[PDB]
């Protein structure tokens with residue numbers, strides 16, 4: 001989580017696409033969906049990012065449809081957005097026990113239980129939180145099995161980005177769950 005506002009500059013693809021889906025939360029505008037292999041994925045927009053501006057004009061109070069409308073009508077050689085980094089999320093850093101556990105239980109990507117003497121307990125991991133990222137990778141829509149494997153494949157040190165379930169649910173509506181398994185960029189970032 002970067003604790004300020006950053007700017008990004010977007011360029012429509014061949015198709016006139018930026019690969020981005022926004023959602024009106026609490027009179028902000030927030031990233032509901034980022035498509036793999038898209039300008040938005042390239043410029044490093046993330047699930048749960050706030051869009052403060054688009055081309056200088058402020059996003060306050062705007063409807064999802066409006067924000068989409070604005071992105072369309074704009075001349076696409078250069079779109080400048082102003083982004084607060086995943087405001088609704090935090091990141092927790094755990095260390096696997098020599099059994100390879102960080103030490104929690106989760107179902108549908110929502111952490112349901114924390115285990116005693118676990119790194120997850122020590123680090124103050126919370127339940128009723130939806131897992132958004134692991135080591136930088138968006139894992140939203142992935143089946144619990146696949147998330148489970150990501151945590152398995154990761155090193156000793158694990159990093160989880162989490163989002164209070166009440167908020168996660170509010171964000172990921174107007175979308176099916178295994179649509180998100182498809183559409184949502186789940187790639188490690190390019191460099």
Ligand SMILES: CC(=O)Nc1ccc(-c2csc(N)n2)cc1
Nearest residue numbers: 020021022033068071174175179
């Ligand atoms: C700029 C723009 O119009 N973005 C946009 C609009 C709608 C959707 C969408 C709704 S349900 C689903 N599976 N995908 C995604 C992205």
